[PDB]
Amino acid sequence: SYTVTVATGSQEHAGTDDYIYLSLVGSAGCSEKHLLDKGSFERGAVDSYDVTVDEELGEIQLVRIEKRKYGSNDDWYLKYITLKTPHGDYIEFPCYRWITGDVEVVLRDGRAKLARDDQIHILKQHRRKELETRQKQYRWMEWNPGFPLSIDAKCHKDLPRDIQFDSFVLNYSKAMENLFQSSWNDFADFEKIFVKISNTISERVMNHWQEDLMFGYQFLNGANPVLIRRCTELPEKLPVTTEMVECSLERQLSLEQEVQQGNIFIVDFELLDGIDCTLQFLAAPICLLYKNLANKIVPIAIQLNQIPGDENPIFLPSDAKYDWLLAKIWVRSSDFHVHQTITHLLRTHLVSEVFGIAMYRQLPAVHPIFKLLVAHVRFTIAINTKAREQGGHVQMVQRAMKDLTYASLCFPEAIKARGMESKEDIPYYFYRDDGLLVWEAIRTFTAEVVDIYYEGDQVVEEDPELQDFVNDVYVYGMRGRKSSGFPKSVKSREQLSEYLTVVIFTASAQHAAVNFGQYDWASWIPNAPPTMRAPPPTAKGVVTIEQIVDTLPDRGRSCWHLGAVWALSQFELFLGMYPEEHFIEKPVKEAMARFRKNLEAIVSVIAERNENLQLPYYYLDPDRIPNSVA
Ligand SMILES: CCCCC/C=C\C/C=C\C/C=C\C/C=C\CCCC(=O)O
Ligand SMILES: [Fe+2]
């Protein structure tokens, strides 16, 4: 007598009323199709059955689930199935899939298996037929020329039910309704709404956004701290002199000497150079920054376009108040657009989707890498499709593709390439510090999982599904661009560990850092103008508060930009939380546990650090890092 346990999901529509047939597949034969008829399958419910089988099945290999339409189609989310055999064996079959009535689902037991592990027909056929199905279901498509490839789906509902997301034209509605308690006339001015809705940081930004210290602070610990790099030599396009900035320098060194000492930093928006209300794209600023005596980064010079000239002045903190202020606003404007389109959209969302699609196409559910990654990438596809389904930013993505390299996705390596690695030359870079801690924890975790399933480098290289996975990413996701630096194949356990870390870190930690600071730093519009309604100033001394108000977005229109950021504020599975148990084996369960302990240690490290800070950095606190881009 077999004891069969079927667990239904707890999503709103997890439950089904349809007919459920179940049969077992053993080495010595198959049982017949048993209708699970008693009651129905309700959300959150677990259902157990006693099933007497005719013949000896041998060792159970597979479980066949069939959903027969009963009335209208009622989608059914199956978490897992367990078996208690008459021989006393306890077998678990992970599923975590939406089941429709148009097909039959077949599950392996929870133990993770490489292709070289399966040498009997029953297992080889299932594995091969599953990939065949995957590769019809999940296909590549070019949404826009030059873009990384994404899922072949025009809309969200055209996605396989498996990767569909239960379910921001709404957010708009959310902000509006929830906001009201106000009057309809509050929408005439965003600031009328702002004081009603302020967190600690945004209120700080409203009061201090005009300060050079806060301006420079954001390049390190703001919503988009990935642009700043150490300047080893003054670019010809920026004809700044010691005399121009002497007032800012504090070490009795010339500008040139400060550069050699590694005290000069630069943010260069040449990505915005050549782009076509569109006016924000008239600028492609170069911001020069200085590490003062207190080891704080402050702006010392700003040129709003790339080509130096009489129509393109170098603005300084010694200029008229409103000259300097408007220059900074333009840099904040540029940082905002790069952050939204490049740092956020391209380098976390689209990248994660590439990994997700390649995973589904090339890795069967039983593969250890599927079990590992599925929690971090699964819903990136649906979310990206929703964003897609409802010109300058397109050009930006195209131009940034050249810079989308594998090396730039490896955190420690990326920090280094920007010359920002030194903790002692740049002590107040909290995104770096926390980033490195989290990256190291994921690196340790992935490495352990790899060592458990891959006995040595040779096993990695000879894993055909892993090789196709990597190859799909390189050829399709990254368009086979050689300069991308992505591996065509993975030949060692270390290389594999690093690659998996790239995927998980990008979808979780990196995304959290560049996403969850959006409201803190962008809710006060003047610090993050989504649009600019006037061209950059082309002369010194002519700027007035009128021109600044005319350049900034309309006060009323800003309510909507504010609403968006705040509604999004309102909203989870966090890093290390794996309630969906694809892995069922003791060794990997122990690695997961060690992962969570390493994370908790980082949580304490960060907490203790934040108490000594005037403006705490909590974006990379593992307690707040989601598993995926969700
Ligand atoms: C109900 C599910 C909601 C899912 C939300 C998923 C991700 C969105 C998160 C942040 C990104 C959203 C927008 C950020 C900035 C504004 C874009 C405005 C575009 C426009 O209007 O011109
Ligand atoms: Fe996001």
| Distance (Å, whole) CA 185 – CA 187 | 5
Closest residue by Cα to atom 10, ligand 1, is 568
| Distance (Å, whole) CA 119 – CA 27 | 12
- 70 phi/psi in degrees, rounded to 5: -120, 100
The pair of structure tokens assigned to 620 is: 């990379």
User: Is residue 94 within a helix (H) or strand (E), and if so which, with residue range?
Assistant: strand 90-99
Residue 471's Cβ-side half-sphere holds a number of Cα atoms within 13 Å equal to 12
Amino acid at 409: L
The pair of structure tokens assigned to 441 is: 């924890």
Give 328 Cα–ligand 2 centroid separation in angstroms. 26
Query: 168: Cβ below 6 Å to ligand 1?
Result: yes
- Judging by beta carbons within 10 Å of its beta carbon (0-12, 13-18, 19+), is residue 474 exposed, middle or buried? buried
The single-letter DSSP state of residue 297 is E
Q: Which residues of 501-538 are buried (b: 16+ CB within 10 A; e: fewer)?
A: bbbbbbbbbbbbbbbbbbbbbbbbbbbbbbbbeeebbe
Task: Judge if 612 and 496 occupy the same domain.
Answer: yes
| Distance (Å, whole) CA 564 – CA 174 | 9
3-class DSSP state of 162? helix
Supply the CATH number for residue 408's domain: 1.20.245.10
566, 197 Cβ separation under 8 angstroms:
yes
Domain-ending residue, one of 306, 335, 364:
335
235, 318 Cβ separation under 8 angstroms:
no
Angle, vertex CA 498, rays to CA 430 and CA 466, nearest 5: 145
Task: Judge if 448 and 489 occupy the same domain.
Answer: yes
Task: Judge if 289 and 347 occupy the same domain.
Answer: no
Task: Judge if 488 and 578 occupy the same domain.
Answer: yes
Which residues have C-beta within 8 Å of that of residue 74, sequence separation ≥ 6? 13, 15, 16, 17, 18, 101
Q: Which residues pair with 7 in a beta bridge?
A: 46, 80
DSSP labels for 215-226? HHHHHHHSS-TT
Query: 167: Cβ below 6 Å to ligand 1?
Result: yes
DSSP labels for 21-58? EEEEEESS-B---EEE-SS-B-TT-EEEEEE--SS---
* Number of the ligand closest to the Cα of 348: 2
- Please name the residue ranges forming H helices in 365-423: 368-377, 380-389, 392-400, 411-417
Task: Judge if 415 and 508 occupy the same domain.
Answer: yes
Domain-ending residue, one of 335, 354, 372:
335
Query: 170: Cβ below 6 Å to ligand 1?
Result: yes
Q: CA-CA distances (angstroms) from residue 205 to 81, 201, 526?
A: 52, 6, 9
Task: Judge if 406 and 532 occupy the same domain.
Answer: yes
Angle, vertex CA 99, rays to CA 97 and CA 101, nearest 5: 170
Supply the CATH number for residue 34's domain: 2.60.60.20
Amino acid at 552: L
Kindly provide the resolution of this structure in angstroms, with one decimal.
Answer: 2.3
| Distance (Å, whole) CA 346 – CA 506 | 11
Query: 564: Cβ below 6 Å to ligand 1?
Result: yes
